Amino acid sequence: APTATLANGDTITGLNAIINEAFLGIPFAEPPVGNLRFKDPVPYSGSLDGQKFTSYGPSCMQQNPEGTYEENLPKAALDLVMQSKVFEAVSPSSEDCLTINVVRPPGTKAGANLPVMLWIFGGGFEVGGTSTFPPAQMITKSIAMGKPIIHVSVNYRVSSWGFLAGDEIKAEGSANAGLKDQRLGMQWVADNIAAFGGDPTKVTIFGESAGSMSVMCHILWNDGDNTYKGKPLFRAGIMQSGAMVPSDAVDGIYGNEIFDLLASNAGCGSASDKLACLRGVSSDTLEDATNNTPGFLAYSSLRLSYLPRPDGVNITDDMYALVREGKYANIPVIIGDQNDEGTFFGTSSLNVTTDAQAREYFKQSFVHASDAEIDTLMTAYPGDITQGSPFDTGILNALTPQFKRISAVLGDLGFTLARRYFLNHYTGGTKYSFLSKQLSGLPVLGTFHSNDIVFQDYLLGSGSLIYNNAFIAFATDLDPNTAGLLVKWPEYTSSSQSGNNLMMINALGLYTGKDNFRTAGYDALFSNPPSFFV
């Protein structure tokens, strides 16, 4: 009953979900199956005329987050759940999964020229789908604000399906397939969103966690040339927990190792052309083989098996060097963090209890760091339990002697201080930054990684003022301060600036503060960023 006539003249029918109009599961690419596996997405060349798009299609195949080549109860348990027919029913996944979803205010028509917020989900570049991030809460708040927006979300390939690396991938020019799927969805939005009522010149890309790192990679893509047919694909970005990816090149040592392990697992260890061997195995075999390489909750934790890597062609270099060197799109950005980003990931190494074990675990994680750098890291993130994450909880939360320390390190390198490095080097547009302390006092996890999805899409809280209202204002006016919040959000210029530069959130509301914490950790980590790449 919602209808839209797309650029090629196909007329499709969506769903009227009374508080909004949805067009769900629209195919934007040919199915990346068989020989199209691990390859760049191909535009969808087919007809959609007269079809209805009233539900989410399957997610892309998902890796077991406890997957590993070792056998253990968490791995076993999550497989039990993931291959259950009830799980398959409620959460279908498929290699044919590249669909896009357009949801809008009731009554929107072609030509309305509403701002578009394009959502990139994140799941440690190994799980995730669009269906789990309901847009209703954002759309309703935008209407009530007088600033209505269209919400678009795009599926992309995750895990081995989407981020296989190594020498053979590099040689074929197929690196970072998953980010290419997101780039092709952006191109579809530029070409088709006006038929839904959206303005192709007012697209804000936003994402959380691996989706946020994805937004960063899109700012850096093609050395910052973000145009399509002579026009920018997005005029702004919002990054919720995640900035540059600390990754070695695609044909680096861990990219190749994971490739060879995967290919032994699928039965391709003796293939002359492993890559062609992996295109021939079944979906079950490939799923199996992937669950036998480490998932992001396994012991390897942030030394991820599948993640964006510089390839020298679309991400031309080390992502930290691209930012020092100015190779980025010049846009206004919001980038923020949850106060205790690493507590989640610290749960993967709870068998590390002594300093000697903590030193070995960092050495295993960071193969390029010298002993002097490991020594500096362990001085800057001391074993003292009052010092680590959950921050400012004293002697509480001491699951081990090292949990709070490993959690402080991992949340900082992967997200919180990575964000400060970007902010201190980026001159492309106005910057805004937030830090949430909304769930201070939550045992074990603190203001944990991803709690912002709850207050953006599910429940209302003091944080929703930022994750919905300030973000809607930014997507409409390019300034979060048009939301008329009582605290003014100051512009971030530098971490050494005078005066408050961070919007902050606690259980009661908003206030501002300074991005001047853990400076010793920032230099331990980022004096020579490649020392801590994976």
Ligand SMILES: *[C@@H]1O[C@H](CO)[C@@H](O[C@@H]2O[C@H](CO)[C@@H](O)[C@H](O)[C@H]2NC(C)=O)[C@H](O)[C@H]1NC(C)=O
């Ligand atoms: C904590 O557990 C991890 C995961 O089992 C241990 O690392 C594994 O150890 C086995 C046996 O030595 C190796 O075969 C695996 O290859 C290791 N896995 C990984 C991902 O490295 C680790 O030894 C334990 N750590 C401590 C401090 O005891």
Ligand SMILES: *[C@@H]1O[C@H](CO)[C@@H](O)[C@H](O)[C@H]1NC(C)=O
């Ligand atoms: C990747 O880089 C090459 C070389 O600049 C370019 O031709 C190609 O269009 C890029 N791919 C995407 C999706 O931007």
